[PDB]
Amino acid sequence: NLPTAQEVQGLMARYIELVDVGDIEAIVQMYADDATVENPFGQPPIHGREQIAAFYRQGLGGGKVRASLTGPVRASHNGSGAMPFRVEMVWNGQPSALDVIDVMRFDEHGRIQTCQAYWSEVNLSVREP
Amino acid sequence: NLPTAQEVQGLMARYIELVDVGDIEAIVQMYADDATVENPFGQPPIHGREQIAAFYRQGLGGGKVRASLTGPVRASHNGSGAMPFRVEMVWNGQPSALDVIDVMRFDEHGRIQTCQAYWSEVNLSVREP
Numbered sequence: 001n002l003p004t005a006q007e008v009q010g011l012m013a014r015y016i017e018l019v020d021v022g023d024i025e026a027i028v029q030m031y032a033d034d035a036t037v038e039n040p041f042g043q044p045p046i047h048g049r050e051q052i053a054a055f056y057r058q059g060l061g062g063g064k065v066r067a068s069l070t071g072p073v074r075a076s077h078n079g080s081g082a083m084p085f086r087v088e089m090v091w092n093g094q095p096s097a098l099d100v101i102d103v104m105r106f107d108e109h110g111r112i113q114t115c116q117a118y119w120s121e122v123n124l125s126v127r128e129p
Numbered sequence: 130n131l132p133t134a135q136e137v138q139g140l141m142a143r144y145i146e147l148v149d150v151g152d153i154e155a156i157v158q159m160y161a162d163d164a165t166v167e168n169p170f171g172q173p174p175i176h177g178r179e180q181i182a183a184f185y186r187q188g189l190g191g192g193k194v195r196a197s198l199t200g201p202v203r204a205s206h207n208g209s210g211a212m213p214f215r216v217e218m219v220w221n222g223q224p225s226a227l228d229v230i231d232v233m234r235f236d237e238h239g240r241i242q243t244c245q246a247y248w249s250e251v252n253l254s255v256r257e258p
């Protein structure tokens with residue numbers, strides 16, 4: 001059934017753990033086979049597990065990327081949620097941090113149907129070595 | 130024109146200041162005249178400045194309510210943003226704090242076209258006397 005608010009908190013928190021260790025296959029499992037991803041929100045969408053896998057492959061492949069929740073997962077009672085987190089990454093050759101909020105909607109099986117990532121240059125912080 | 134990422138950060142931050150002081154008129158001023166509010170997200174949307182005003186009147190009238198940002202506004206390049214904040218209020222006769230994330234979309238006039246408040250009881254915390 002459509003995930004309860006508690007279940008949403010659990011799923012979304014796990015997603016971040018998966019990102020943090022680059023478990024691309026487990027991430028793909030979390031998504032519905034016809035999921036949509038808009039990251040960053042504002043840019044053209046990608047659809048389907050094949051593309052989504054490709055997107056995560058290039059985002060989390062190669063460069064060393066970390067991710068951790070910086071605040072509680074906000075969860076609705078209609079199978080959606082939103083979470084604030086921080087992504088650590090190398091940007092323009094240097095260690096940087098990016099503040100992001102993800103919004104996700106889940107289907108009746110508990111798979112991610114939709115994911116939108118809110119961030120831009122204004123949320124980017126280069127970290128003086 | 131459509132608010133830049135930096136303007137979105139400023140608009141959304143100002144919105145919170147206006148909720149905090151309960152300036153209903155100034156809050157509705159920020160909305161586009163055919164805007165929609167979904168709060169809690171999941172609940173049927175309310176449409177139009179008149180219905181929106183009534184919502185804020187009943188939400189911010191009577192009981193004492195404060196709000197403040199708990200992190201940076203995340204902003205995209207299509208006039209959209211998301212923000213984490215905390216709402217302080219009396220819930221069931223007892224002072225409580227609610228963690229919320231609002232998603233907003235602005236129009237070409239810098240007015241709010243859509244507002245979606247992600248929160249539920251899982252994000253509610255009763256303060257102990």
Ligand SMILES: C[C@]12CCc3c(ccc4cc(O)ccc34)[C@@H]1CCC2=O
Binds near residue numbers: 059100102
């Ligand atoms: C893609 C990325 C690494 C991972 C990542 C970014 C931004 C938003 C994200 C949102 C997610 O839900 C999961 C991963 C990312 C970074 C932006 C630039 C960078 O290299």
Ligand SMILES: C[C@]12CCc3c(ccc4cc(O)ccc34)[C@@H]1CCC2=O
Binds near residue numbers: 148168188227231
């Ligand atoms: C409405 C409310 C006080 C204000 C408020 C709540 C929830 C989400 C909000 C989102 C906003 O963008 C502005 C104000 C609120 C609380 C939930 C219960 C309560 O009384």
